[PDB]
mmCIF file of C-alpha atoms in Angstrom:
data_model
loop_
_atom_site.group_PDB
_atom_site.id
_atom_site.type_symbol
_atom_site.label_atom_id
_atom_site.label_comp_id
_atom_site.label_asym_id
_atom_site.label_seq_id
_atom_site.Cartn_x
_atom_site.Cartn_y
_atom_site.Cartn_z
ATOM 1 C CA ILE A 196 -22.696 -3.240 -0.333
ATOM 2 C CA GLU A 197 -22.869 -1.877 -4.005
ATOM 3 C CA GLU A 198 -24.054 1.536 -3.340
ATOM 4 C CA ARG A 199 -21.836 2.164 -0.524
ATOM 5 C CA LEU A 200 -19.188 0.889 -2.948
ATOM 6 C CA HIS A 201 -19.726 3.283 -4.738
ATOM 7 C CA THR A 202 -20.088 6.589 -2.859
ATOM 8 C CA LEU A 203 -16.889 5.003 -2.025
ATOM 9 C CA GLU A 204 -15.695 5.611 -5.454
ATOM 10 C CA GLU A 205 -16.829 9.249 -6.255
ATOM 11 C CA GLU A 206 -14.666 9.355 -2.983
ATOM 12 C CA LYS A 207 -12.076 8.519 -4.063
ATOM 13 C CA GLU A 208 -11.151 10.821 -7.016
ATOM 14 C CA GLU A 209 -11.636 13.865 -5.136
ATOM 15 C CA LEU A 210 -9.325 12.767 -3.043
ATOM 16 C CA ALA A 211 -6.999 12.442 -5.206
ATOM 17 C CA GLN A 212 -7.296 15.062 -6.606
ATOM 18 C CA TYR A 213 -7.301 16.875 -3.133
ATOM 19 C CA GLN A 214 -3.710 15.957 -2.968
ATOM 20 C CA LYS A 215 -2.083 16.355 -5.351
ATOM 21 C CA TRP A 216 -2.973 20.492 -4.487
ATOM 22 C CA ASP A 217 -1.778 19.702 -1.222
ATOM 23 C CA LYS A 218 1.538 18.585 -3.219
ATOM 24 C CA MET A 219 1.636 22.085 -5.047
ATOM 25 C CA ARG A 220 0.927 23.869 -0.848
ATOM 26 C CA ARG A 221 4.743 21.762 0.268
ATOM 27 C CA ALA A 222 5.997 22.164 -3.170
ATOM 28 C CA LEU A 223 5.867 26.598 -2.486
ATOM 29 C CA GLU A 224 5.676 27.195 1.276
ATOM 30 C CA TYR A 225 9.501 24.812 0.702
ATOM 31 C CA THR A 226 10.391 27.204 -2.423
ATOM 32 C CA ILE A 227 9.315 30.878 -0.309
ATOM 33 C CA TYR A 228 10.871 29.974 3.194
ATOM 34 C CA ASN A 229 14.423 28.968 1.146
ATOM 35 C CA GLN A 230 13.913 32.825 -0.356
ATOM 36 C CA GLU A 231 13.380 33.980 3.914
ATOM 37 C CA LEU A 232 16.454 31.817 4.625
ATOM 38 C CA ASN A 233 18.639 33.640 1.637
ATOM 39 C CA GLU A 234 17.224 36.671 2.628
ATOM 40 C CA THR A 235 18.418 35.988 6.131
ATOM 41 C CA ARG A 236 22.155 35.765 4.707
ATOM 42 C CA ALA A 237 21.492 38.958 3.381
ATOM 43 C CA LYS A 934 15.785 37.827 15.341
ATOM 44 C CA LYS A 935 13.023 38.388 13.078
ATOM 45 C CA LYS A 936 15.228 35.848 10.563
ATOM 46 C CA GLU A 937 16.029 33.571 12.349
ATOM 47 C CA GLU A 938 13.104 33.365 13.482
ATOM 48 C CA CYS A 939 11.619 32.737 10.517
ATOM 49 C CA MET A 940 14.265 29.518 10.136
ATOM 50 C CA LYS A 941 12.688 27.991 13.179
ATOM 51 C CA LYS A 942 9.801 28.255 11.295
ATOM 52 C CA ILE A 943 11.017 26.551 7.916
ATOM 53 C CA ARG A 944 12.877 24.352 10.100
ATOM 54 C CA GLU A 945 9.147 23.570 12.057
ATOM 55 C CA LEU A 946 6.932 23.035 9.295
ATOM 56 C CA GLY A 947 8.315 20.416 8.039
ATOM 57 C CA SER A 948 6.963 20.438 4.151
ATOM 58 C CA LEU A 949 7.104 17.325 2.979
ATOM 59 C CA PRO A 950 8.658 17.689 -0.688
ATOM 60 C CA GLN A 951 8.228 15.986 -3.570
ATOM 61 C CA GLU A 952 9.884 14.969 -7.404
ATOM 62 C CA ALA A 953 7.730 18.653 -8.362
ATOM 63 C CA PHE A 954 9.411 21.240 -6.409
ATOM 64 C CA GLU A 955 12.647 22.559 -8.600
ATOM 65 C CA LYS A 956 10.353 22.932 -11.228
ATOM 66 C CA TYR A 957 8.030 24.855 -9.701
ATOM 67 C CA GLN A 958 10.762 28.269 -9.334
ATOM 68 C CA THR A 959 8.777 31.871 -10.244
ATOM 69 C CA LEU A 960 11.197 34.701 -7.826
ATOM 70 C CA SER A 961 8.413 37.278 -8.144
ATOM 71 C CA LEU A 962 7.718 36.652 -3.323
ATOM 72 C CA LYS A 963 3.912 38.192 -4.375
ATOM 73 C CA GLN A 964 2.912 35.965 -7.977
ATOM 74 C CA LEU A 965 3.901 33.425 -5.453
ATOM 75 C CA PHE A 966 1.373 34.378 -2.688
ATOM 76 C CA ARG A 967 -1.301 34.593 -5.192
ATOM 77 C CA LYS A 968 -0.642 31.450 -5.617
ATOM 78 C CA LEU A 969 -0.828 29.782 -2.286
ATOM 79 C CA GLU A 970 -3.560 31.964 -1.222
ATOM 80 C CA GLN A 971 -5.036 30.542 -3.996
ATOM 81 C CA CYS A 972 -3.746 26.633 -3.578
ATOM 82 C CA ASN A 973 -5.440 27.460 0.027
ATOM 83 C CA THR A 974 -7.827 27.801 -0.495
ATOM 84 C CA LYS B 10 -17.318 -42.091 10.033
ATOM 85 C CA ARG B 11 -15.656 -43.252 6.493
ATOM 86 C CA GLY B 12 -16.467 -42.801 2.898
ATOM 87 C CA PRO B 13 -17.439 -39.591 0.764
ATOM 88 C CA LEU B 14 -20.522 -39.248 2.331
ATOM 89 C CA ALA B 15 -19.163 -39.372 5.949
ATOM 90 C CA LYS B 16 -20.121 -36.100 6.497
ATOM 91 C CA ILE B 17 -23.303 -36.310 5.688
ATOM 92 C CA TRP B 18 -23.670 -38.972 7.770
ATOM 93 C CA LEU B 19 -22.931 -37.423 10.936
ATOM 94 C CA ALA B 20 -24.745 -33.478 10.034
ATOM 95 C CA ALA B 21 -27.750 -36.263 10.672
ATOM 96 C CA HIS B 22 -26.634 -38.267 13.490
ATOM 97 C CA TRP B 23 -24.856 -36.497 15.356
ATOM 98 C CA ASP B 24 -23.942 -33.345 14.840
ATOM 99 C CA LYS B 25 -21.944 -31.592 17.035
ATOM 100 C CA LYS B 26 -18.642 -32.705 16.296
ATOM 101 C CA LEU B 27 -18.817 -30.993 12.647
ATOM 102 C CA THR B 28 -16.544 -28.287 12.988
ATOM 103 C CA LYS B 29 -16.713 -24.927 11.625
ATOM 104 C CA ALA B 30 -13.872 -26.325 9.446
ATOM 105 C CA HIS B 31 -15.626 -28.791 7.454
ATOM 106 C CA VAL B 32 -19.210 -26.787 6.956
ATOM 107 C CA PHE B 33 -17.686 -24.447 4.955
ATOM 108 C CA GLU B 34 -15.757 -25.888 2.025
ATOM 109 C CA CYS B 35 -15.793 -29.869 2.245
ATOM 110 C CA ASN B 36 -18.726 -31.164 0.181
ATOM 111 C CA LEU B 37 -19.346 -29.451 -3.197
ATOM 112 C CA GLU B 38 -23.408 -29.774 -2.739
ATOM 113 C CA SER B 39 -23.901 -30.472 -7.158
ATOM 114 C CA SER B 40 -21.918 -32.708 -6.500
ATOM 115 C CA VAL B 41 -22.849 -34.545 -2.909
ATOM 116 C CA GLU B 42 -26.567 -34.862 -3.441
ATOM 117 C CA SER B 43 -25.927 -35.586 -7.385
ATOM 118 C CA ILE B 44 -24.205 -38.767 -5.990
ATOM 119 C CA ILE B 45 -26.285 -40.309 -3.763
ATOM 120 C CA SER B 46 -29.255 -40.124 -6.139
ATOM 121 C CA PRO B 47 -27.378 -43.494 -7.824
ATOM 122 C CA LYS B 48 -25.506 -45.108 -5.764
ATOM 123 C CA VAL B 49 -25.641 -48.903 -4.759
ATOM 124 C CA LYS B 50 -27.639 -50.656 -3.199
ATOM 125 C CA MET B 51 -29.706 -46.989 -0.805
ATOM 126 C CA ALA B 52 -32.559 -48.291 1.099
ATOM 127 C CA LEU B 53 -35.040 -45.167 1.888
ATOM 128 C CA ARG B 54 -34.646 -45.098 5.241
ATOM 129 C CA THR B 55 -31.097 -44.075 5.553
ATOM 130 C CA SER B 56 -31.567 -42.411 2.022
ATOM 131 C CA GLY B 57 -34.198 -39.684 4.296
ATOM 132 C CA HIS B 58 -31.822 -39.581 6.858
ATOM 133 C CA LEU B 59 -29.110 -38.081 5.001
ATOM 134 C CA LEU B 60 -32.284 -36.246 2.541
ATOM 135 C CA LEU B 61 -31.062 -33.987 6.570
ATOM 136 C CA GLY B 62 -28.014 -34.490 6.472
ATOM 137 C CA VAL B 63 -28.147 -32.485 3.685
ATOM 138 C CA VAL B 64 -30.038 -30.138 5.237
ATOM 139 C CA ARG B 65 -28.958 -29.120 7.857
ATOM 140 C CA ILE B 66 -25.497 -28.674 5.772
ATOM 141 C CA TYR B 67 -26.744 -26.737 3.263
ATOM 142 C CA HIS B 68 -28.231 -24.573 6.276
ATOM 143 C CA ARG B 69 -25.442 -23.951 8.092
ATOM 144 C CA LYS B 70 -23.448 -23.286 4.675
ATOM 145 C CA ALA B 71 -26.000 -19.926 4.936
ATOM 146 C CA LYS B 72 -25.546 -18.873 8.694
ATOM 147 C CA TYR B 73 -22.388 -18.532 8.143
ATOM 148 C CA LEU B 74 -22.841 -16.363 4.517
ATOM 149 C CA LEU B 75 -24.787 -14.242 6.509
ATOM 150 C CA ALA B 76 -22.871 -13.410 8.965
ATOM 151 C CA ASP B 77 -19.419 -12.699 7.206
ATOM 152 C CA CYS B 78 -21.562 -10.002 4.939
ATOM 153 C CA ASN B 79 -22.780 -8.254 8.024
ATOM 154 C CA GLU B 80 -19.452 -8.645 9.260
ATOM 155 C CA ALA B 81 -18.122 -6.677 6.369
ATOM 156 C CA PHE B 82 -21.281 -3.888 5.498
ATOM 157 C CA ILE B 83 -20.689 -3.115 9.119
ATOM 158 C CA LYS B 84 -17.000 -2.863 8.639
ATOM 159 C CA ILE B 85 -17.901 -0.589 5.018
ATOM 160 C CA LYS B 86 -19.514 2.129 7.530
ATOM 161 C CA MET B 87 -16.480 3.659 9.160
ATOM 162 C CA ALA B 88 -14.198 6.353 6.869
ATOM 163 C CA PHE B 89 -11.500 8.659 8.722
ATOM 164 C CA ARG B 90 -12.135 11.677 7.624
ATOM 165 C CA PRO B 91 -10.340 14.311 9.905
ATOM 166 C CA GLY B 92 -12.066 17.414 9.088
ATOM 167 C CA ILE B 154 -28.777 -10.416 57.162
ATOM 168 C CA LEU B 155 -31.530 -13.380 57.179
ATOM 169 C CA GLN B 156 -32.643 -12.074 53.330
ATOM 170 C CA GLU B 157 -34.154 -15.610 52.456
ATOM 171 C CA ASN B 158 -33.641 -18.781 54.814
ATOM 172 C CA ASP B 159 -36.702 -20.823 54.077
ATOM 173 C CA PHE B 160 -38.595 -21.065 57.511
ATOM 174 C CA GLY B 161 -36.375 -23.263 60.187
ATOM 175 C CA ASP B 162 -34.766 -27.094 58.865
ATOM 176 C CA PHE B 163 -38.030 -28.389 58.103
ATOM 177 C CA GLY B 164 -37.496 -27.495 54.220
ATOM 178 C CA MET B 165 -33.974 -29.090 54.179
ATOM 179 C CA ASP B 166 -33.079 -31.016 56.949
ATOM 180 C CA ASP B 167 -34.820 -34.921 55.902
ATOM 181 C CA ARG B 168 -34.853 -36.825 59.174
ATOM 182 C CA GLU B 169 -33.189 -39.955 60.604
ATOM 183 C CA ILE B 170 -35.473 -42.695 59.852
ATOM 184 C CA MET B 171 -35.614 -45.472 63.117
ATOM 185 C CA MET C 31 35.781 13.972 15.963
ATOM 186 C CA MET C 32 37.024 17.919 14.367
ATOM 187 C CA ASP C 33 36.911 15.621 11.146
ATOM 188 C CA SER C 34 39.336 12.683 11.787
ATOM 189 C CA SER C 35 38.791 13.018 7.740
ATOM 190 C CA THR C 36 40.185 9.384 6.526
ATOM 191 C CA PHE C 37 36.086 6.302 7.387
ATOM 192 C CA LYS C 38 35.022 10.058 5.698
ATOM 193 C CA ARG C 39 37.197 9.627 3.097
ATOM 194 C CA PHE C 40 36.646 5.816 3.201
ATOM 195 C CA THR C 41 32.894 6.726 2.624
ATOM 196 C CA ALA C 42 33.154 9.967 0.510
ATOM 197 C CA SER C 43 34.842 7.823 -2.218
ATOM 198 C CA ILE C 44 32.749 4.824 -2.061
ATOM 199 C CA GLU C 45 29.841 8.113 -3.177
ATOM 200 C CA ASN C 46 31.593 9.170 -4.765
ATOM 201 C CA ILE C 47 33.204 7.082 -7.542
ATOM 202 C CA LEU C 48 29.832 4.587 -7.614
ATOM 203 C CA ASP C 49 28.293 7.390 -8.587
ATOM 204 C CA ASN C 50 30.506 8.386 -10.779
ATOM 205 C CA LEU C 51 31.491 5.296 -12.908
ATOM 206 C CA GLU C 52 27.188 4.796 -12.635
ATOM 207 C CA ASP C 53 25.878 7.949 -13.232
ATOM 208 C CA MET C 54 27.273 8.977 -16.211
ATOM 209 C CA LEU C 69 22.027 -0.801 -15.141
ATOM 210 C CA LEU C 70 22.745 -1.277 -10.496
ATOM 211 C CA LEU C 71 25.287 -1.379 -8.361
ATOM 212 C CA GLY C 72 25.118 -4.800 -7.687
ATOM 213 C CA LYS C 73 24.882 -6.343 -3.380
ATOM 214 C CA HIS C 74 28.811 -5.968 -3.089
ATOM 215 C CA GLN C 75 28.759 -2.130 -3.032
ATOM 216 C CA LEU C 76 25.446 -1.620 -1.378
ATOM 217 C CA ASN C 77 27.585 -4.100 1.898
ATOM 218 C CA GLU C 78 29.807 -2.017 1.553
ATOM 219 C CA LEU C 79 28.865 0.990 1.928
ATOM 220 C CA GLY C 80 26.320 0.501 4.960
ATOM 221 C CA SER C 81 28.391 -1.497 7.097
ATOM 222 C CA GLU C 82 30.565 1.838 7.147
ATOM 223 C CA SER C 83 27.533 3.958 7.305
ATOM 224 C CA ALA C 84 26.799 1.484 10.726
ATOM 225 C CA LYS C 85 29.579 3.043 12.925
ATOM 226 C CA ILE C 86 32.116 4.919 10.644
ATOM 227 C CA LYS C 87 29.204 6.686 8.837
ATOM 228 C CA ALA C 88 27.133 6.448 12.847
ATOM 229 C CA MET C 89 28.774 10.566 12.785
ATOM 230 C CA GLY C 90 30.318 10.880 10.000
ATOM 231 C CA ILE C 91 27.626 12.062 7.249
ATOM 232 C CA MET C 92 27.295 14.869 7.848
ATOM 233 C CA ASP C 93 29.430 17.427 5.753
ATOM 234 C CA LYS C 94 28.991 16.383 2.192
ATOM 235 C CA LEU C 95 27.269 17.406 -0.688
ATOM 236 C CA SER C 96 23.692 18.091 -0.546
ATOM 237 C CA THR C 97 22.551 17.430 -4.519
ATOM 238 C CA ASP C 98 25.164 15.000 -4.618
ATOM 239 C CA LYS C 99 22.639 13.148 -1.632
ATOM 240 C CA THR C 100 20.189 13.810 -3.446
ATOM 241 C CA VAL C 101 20.768 12.102 -6.717
ATOM 242 C CA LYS C 102 22.265 9.846 -5.083
ATOM 243 C CA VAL C 103 19.428 7.985 -3.054
ATOM 244 C CA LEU C 104 17.422 8.253 -5.958
ATOM 245 C CA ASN C 105 18.827 5.780 -8.014
ATOM 246 C CA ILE C 106 19.504 3.076 -5.124
ATOM 247 C CA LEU C 107 15.703 4.514 -5.147
ATOM 248 C CA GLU C 108 15.257 3.039 -8.259
ATOM 249 C CA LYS C 109 17.027 0.010 -6.848
ATOM 250 C CA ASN C 110 14.325 -0.640 -4.535
ATOM 251 C CA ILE C 111 11.692 -0.119 -7.343
ATOM 252 C CA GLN C 112 12.300 -3.701 -8.331
ATOM 253 C CA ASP C 113 11.402 -5.136 -5.960
ATOM 254 C CA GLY C 114 8.091 -3.385 -4.287
ATOM 255 C CA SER C 115 5.663 -5.805 -5.345
ATOM 256 C CA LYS C 116 8.181 -8.745 -6.874
ATOM 257 C CA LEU C 117 5.338 -11.624 -6.159
ATOM 258 C CA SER C 118 7.915 -14.635 -5.569
ATOM 259 C CA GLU C 131 15.796 -24.798 -8.619
ATOM 260 C CA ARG C 132 18.025 -21.601 -10.132
ATOM 261 C CA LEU C 133 15.246 -18.994 -10.757
ATOM 262 C CA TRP C 134 14.685 -19.670 -7.359
ATOM 263 C CA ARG C 135 18.233 -18.800 -6.955
ATOM 264 C CA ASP C 136 17.678 -14.999 -9.131
ATOM 265 C CA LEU C 137 15.115 -13.957 -6.566
ATOM 266 C CA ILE C 138 17.014 -14.257 -3.204
ATOM 267 C CA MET C 139 19.476 -12.723 -4.821
ATOM 268 C CA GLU C 140 17.285 -10.327 -5.938
ATOM 269 C CA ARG C 141 15.473 -9.944 -2.133
ATOM 270 C CA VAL C 142 18.742 -9.684 -0.573
ATOM 271 C CA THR C 143 19.973 -6.791 -3.081
ATOM 272 C CA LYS C 144 17.150 -4.828 -2.652
ATOM 273 C CA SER C 145 17.277 -5.297 0.927
ATOM 274 C CA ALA C 146 20.167 -3.913 1.668
ATOM 275 C CA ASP C 147 18.891 -1.091 0.028
ATOM 276 C CA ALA C 148 16.456 -0.633 2.359
ATOM 277 C CA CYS C 149 18.814 -0.583 5.045
ATOM 278 C CA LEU C 150 21.327 1.888 3.039
ATOM 279 C CA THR C 151 18.392 4.385 2.041
ATOM 280 C CA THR C 152 16.752 4.635 6.111
ATOM 281 C CA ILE C 153 20.472 3.798 8.061
ATOM 282 C CA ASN C 154 20.823 7.652 5.844
ATOM 283 C CA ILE C 155 18.455 9.358 5.737
ATOM 284 C CA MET C 156 18.649 8.930 9.940
ATOM 285 C CA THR C 157 21.809 8.548 11.137
ATOM 286 C CA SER C 158 22.594 12.218 11.438
ATOM 287 C CA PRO C 159 21.020 14.201 14.462
ATOM 288 C CA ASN C 160 20.596 17.170 12.193
ATOM 289 C CA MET C 161 20.813 17.499 8.339
ATOM 290 C CA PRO C 162 20.181 20.055 5.649
ATOM 291 C CA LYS C 163 16.235 19.980 4.848
ATOM 292 C CA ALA C 164 14.631 18.495 1.323
ATOM 293 C CA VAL C 165 17.347 16.270 1.554
ATOM 294 C CA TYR C 166 15.265 13.357 2.463
ATOM 295 C CA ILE C 167 11.367 13.173 -0.074
ATOM 296 C CA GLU C 168 8.246 11.005 1.103
ATOM 297 C CA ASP C 169 9.153 9.024 -2.316
ATOM 298 C CA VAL C 170 11.645 6.950 -0.773
ATOM 299 C CA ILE C 171 9.333 7.473 2.994
ATOM 300 C CA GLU C 172 6.370 5.423 0.827
ATOM 301 C CA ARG C 173 8.431 2.893 -1.371
ATOM 302 C CA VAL C 174 10.608 1.553 1.987
ATOM 303 C CA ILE C 175 7.615 2.076 4.004
ATOM 304 C CA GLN C 176 5.886 -1.003 0.933
ATOM 305 C CA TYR C 177 8.200 -2.698 0.466
ATOM 306 C CA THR C 178 9.434 -3.673 4.061
ATOM 307 C CA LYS C 179 4.997 -4.907 3.954
ATOM 308 C CA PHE C 180 4.126 -6.695 1.868
ATOM 309 C CA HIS C 181 8.441 -8.626 1.623
ATOM 310 C CA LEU C 182 7.381 -9.335 5.160
ATOM 311 C CA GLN C 183 3.687 -9.757 5.794
ATOM 312 C CA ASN C 184 4.509 -12.521 1.991
ATOM 313 C CA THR C 185 7.836 -14.063 2.803
ATOM 314 C CA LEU C 186 8.091 -14.401 6.362
ATOM 315 C CA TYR C 187 5.757 -14.888 8.292
ATOM 316 C CA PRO C 188 4.554 -17.954 6.387
ATOM 317 C CA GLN C 189 8.770 -19.659 6.266
ATOM 318 C CA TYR C 190 8.486 -18.371 10.072
ATOM 319 C CA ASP C 191 5.222 -19.916 10.887
ATOM 320 C CA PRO C 192 2.784 -22.421 10.217
ATOM 321 C CA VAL C 193 -0.031 -20.498 11.319
ATOM 322 C CA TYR C 194 -0.055 -18.436 7.849
ATOM 323 C CA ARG C 195 1.939 -21.330 6.137
ATOM 324 C CA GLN C 218 17.232 -21.621 3.834
ATOM 325 C CA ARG C 219 20.015 -19.382 5.505
ATOM 326 C CA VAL C 220 19.108 -16.532 2.876
ATOM 327 C CA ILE C 221 15.895 -16.547 5.253
ATOM 328 C CA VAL C 222 17.612 -15.533 8.503
ATOM 329 C CA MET C 223 19.897 -12.580 6.658
ATOM 330 C CA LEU C 224 16.523 -11.119 5.293
ATOM 331 C CA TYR C 225 14.981 -11.558 9.306
ATOM 332 C CA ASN C 226 17.212 -9.837 10.897
ATOM 333 C CA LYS C 227 18.121 -7.087 7.952
ATOM 334 C CA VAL C 228 13.457 -6.428 8.399
ATOM 335 C CA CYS C 229 14.881 -5.742 11.915
ATOM 336 C CA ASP C 230 17.226 -3.014 11.540
ATOM 337 C CA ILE C 231 14.671 -1.308 8.760
ATOM 338 C CA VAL C 232 12.647 -1.001 11.145
ATOM 339 C CA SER C 233 14.425 -0.149 14.515
ATOM 340 C CA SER C 234 15.895 2.673 12.505
ATOM 341 C CA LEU C 235 12.671 2.710 10.754
ATOM 342 C CA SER C 236 10.602 4.004 14.274
ATOM 343 C CA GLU C 237 13.539 6.353 15.066
ATOM 344 C CA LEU C 238 12.684 8.480 12.478
ATOM 345 C CA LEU C 239 9.809 8.842 12.463
ATOM 346 C CA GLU C 240 10.259 10.591 15.922
ATOM 347 C CA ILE C 241 12.425 13.142 14.285
ATOM 348 C CA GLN C 242 10.476 14.645 11.374
ATOM 349 C CA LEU C 243 6.091 15.296 10.752
ATOM 350 C CA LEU C 244 4.902 13.092 7.648
ATOM 351 C CA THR C 245 2.196 13.214 6.202
ATOM 352 C CA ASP C 246 -1.261 11.426 7.485
ATOM 353 C CA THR C 247 -1.064 8.763 3.796
ATOM 354 C CA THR C 248 1.410 7.146 4.980
ATOM 355 C CA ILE C 249 1.224 7.233 8.405
ATOM 356 C CA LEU C 250 -2.016 4.575 7.559
ATOM 357 C CA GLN C 251 0.127 2.100 5.613
ATOM 358 C CA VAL C 252 3.392 2.277 8.630
ATOM 359 C CA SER C 253 0.615 1.270 11.545
ATOM 360 C CA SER C 254 -0.752 -0.883 9.428
ATOM 361 C CA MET C 255 1.756 -2.658 8.970
ATOM 362 C CA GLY C 256 3.865 -2.321 12.842
ATOM 363 C CA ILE C 257 0.455 -3.416 13.782
ATOM 364 C CA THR C 258 0.474 -7.270 11.900
ATOM 365 C CA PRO C 259 3.562 -8.644 13.563
ATOM 366 C CA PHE C 260 1.875 -9.424 17.026
ATOM 367 C CA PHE C 261 0.192 -11.869 15.134
ATOM 368 C CA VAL C 262 2.959 -14.128 14.251
ATOM 369 C CA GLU C 263 4.461 -17.146 16.753
ATOM 370 C CA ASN C 264 8.729 -16.991 16.214
ATOM 371 C CA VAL C 265 9.146 -13.417 15.659
ATOM 372 C CA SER C 266 9.796 -12.233 19.431
ATOM 373 C CA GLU C 267 12.754 -9.126 18.160
ATOM 374 C CA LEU C 268 10.314 -8.574 15.708
ATOM 375 C CA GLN C 269 7.895 -7.651 18.155
ATOM 376 C CA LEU C 270 9.503 -6.416 19.836
ATOM 377 C CA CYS C 271 10.742 -3.332 17.342
ATOM 378 C CA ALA C 272 6.868 -3.009 15.731
ATOM 379 C CA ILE C 273 6.204 -2.521 19.583
ATOM 380 C CA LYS C 274 9.250 0.840 19.211
ATOM 381 C CA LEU C 275 7.156 1.600 15.991
ATOM 382 C CA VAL C 276 4.080 1.700 17.024
ATOM 383 C CA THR C 277 4.253 3.798 20.407
ATOM 384 C CA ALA C 278 6.312 6.330 18.351
ATOM 385 C CA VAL C 279 3.782 6.624 16.284
ATOM 386 C CA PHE C 280 1.152 7.082 19.434
ATOM 387 C CA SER C 281 2.601 9.219 20.762
ATOM 388 C CA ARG C 282 3.150 11.843 17.964
ATOM 389 C CA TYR C 283 -0.026 12.020 16.012
ATOM 390 C CA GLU C 284 -3.184 12.970 18.448
ATOM 391 C CA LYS C 285 -5.364 11.866 15.598
ATOM 392 C CA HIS C 286 -4.861 7.696 14.652
ATOM 393 C CA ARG C 287 -5.343 6.310 18.316
ATOM 394 C CA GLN C 288 -9.331 5.673 17.538
ATOM 395 C CA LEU C 289 -7.385 3.660 14.684
ATOM 396 C CA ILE C 290 -5.334 1.417 16.014
ATOM 397 C CA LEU C 291 -7.086 0.240 19.157
ATOM 398 C CA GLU C 292 -9.933 -0.285 16.313
ATOM 399 C CA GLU C 293 -6.909 -2.386 14.685
ATOM 400 C CA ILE C 294 -5.782 -3.806 17.742
ATOM 401 C CA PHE C 295 -9.078 -5.128 18.795
ATOM 402 C CA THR C 296 -11.309 -6.593 15.889
ATOM 403 C CA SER C 297 -8.340 -9.318 15.600
ATOM 404 C CA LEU C 298 -8.103 -10.630 19.818
ATOM 405 C CA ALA C 299 -8.544 -13.813 17.857
#
């Protein structure tokens, strides 16, 4: 039981880190699709509306702080988060 | 029966009515066995009976501790990583004890 | 109706005056009780067509309210306890009705934090106050009041869980809380609301079925 408890603690820390990164990804996805809805305000665009309402990317308090406007630096941040 | 040693009496004589609720925390070993040794007018016979009683109690405690520990360890190994005549006696002579006269 | 903006006006007025007088330290039971009774029947359909970040900040404030009894761990101090308990349970009712009541809202009008809060709140309060007083196996009018509050909460929460997708970490807590009621005695209505909750969880996500089967099988004794 002692050995297994130790390995469990290690996995706990790993989980904390993964949880953080996933929160980051969800916030980024929501923000870029909001920008795409603003684009919808300028077929395919109603489809991306369907996307953003489909995903249910549960937002967190850290959302509004991460406001970058590039849409390409956004994509590289999203790719790194995904990796 | 009656007394702060009735549990050990039962465990040494009958042992069946003794429930899983009794055995666990009813008796504090280091106190009760200590009580047995200087108790007034204790016969050697009854003392031997009480000895077998207390040893049976202790053995049962060991059994329960092992069972609960084993349960816990089996739990901890779990995780969630989402990624016709067949046999008749020959005639009746087997069971047909005849009537007397 | 089209708008029928008179009890729409009731609730809009209540909300803006209240978060103005608070924002510029808790609202108190009366405000929450009145807002909830207007959320129930009046705002059964009237919660739509309002200001978004307004809702964001007020639900954040009543979240800060909710946190006051999450792990509260509880002849006059007892009175203080029961006051705090009814206030926070009324508040929890408020938040879980406001998140769900409309068939449609904008996205990001409900952040998972208030979700987690109301979940753990009901878990602790239920499993540490309701079962002991309702069943001698585990172990005055305020108790029945809290019981009714919890039934409303779990029903509304079942519906909310049906609407949108969620993250597994919350799901583990929700499933454990919803499996809990089937093993005490006099809780029938709570039991069937828990039926609703557990069956919604079993419907949506096709990866926790084995977990619910194990958590049923373990405690059959």
